[PDB]
DNA sequence: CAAGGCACATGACAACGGTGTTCAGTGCCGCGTTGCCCGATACCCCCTACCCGTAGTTGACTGGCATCCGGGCGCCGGGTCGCC
């Protein structure tokens, strides 16, 4: 029963192609240096700032795109790997 | 014939005889309470074969696993659907 609910949770997602990986890949490495450029002590201007803090979350936005897609592909290797003594 | 003079013994007189006593001291030779001298054993030390925790492994490899029955009865009780 709740394995059927979580299925249903992945639901319809959009797969990922190498373009969209890609550029969904360089989101996420401008979104980690926008996060440690905010991290320094050193003052940073206001709106500067929340750009900064808008590309992160768009990288963190980009980073649940990856997990969701690749959720069935793991489950995939836990049915190789199931049947062992864990559930 | 009576009174006065000499022998032997005699009332006491201490001091020896000999033995068993008073202190008292110190041992004599049987029973006890603690000194040896060791010997062992508990407590520190160093390192090392192994036990246990963590870090990676670049063709790709994208939804399981189901259940499946001959009770059977019987009721309660409520939920859902039907009626209108």
Same mark, same amino acid.
């Given at each position: 029963?709740? =394995?059927?609910?979580?299925?249903?949770?992945?639901? +319809?997602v959009p797969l990922?192609?190498?373009?969209?990986? =890609?550029?969904?890949?360089?989101?996420? !490495?401008?979104?980690?240096? *926008?996060?440690? +450029?905010?991290?320094?002590?050193?003052? %940073?201007?206001?709106? %500067?700032?929340? !750009?900064?803090?808008?590309? *992160?979350?768009?990288?963190?936005? $980009?980073?649940?795109?990856?997990?969701? *897609?690749?959720?069935?592909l793991v489950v995939?290797? $836990?049915?190789?790997?199931?049947?062992?003594?864990?559930?």
């Amino acid at each position: 029963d709740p =394995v059927k609910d979580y299925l249903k949770q992945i639901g +319809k997602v959009p797969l990922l192609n190498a373009e969209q990986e =890609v550029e969904l890949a360089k989101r996420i !490495e401008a979104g980690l240096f *926008a996060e440690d +450029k905010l991290a320094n002590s050193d003052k %940073l201007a206001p709106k %500067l700032k929340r !750009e900064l803090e808008i590309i *992160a979350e768009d990288g963190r936005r $980009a980073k649940n795109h990856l997990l969701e *897609a690749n959720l069935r592909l793991v489950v995939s290797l $836990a049915k190789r790997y199931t049947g062992r003594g864990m559930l």
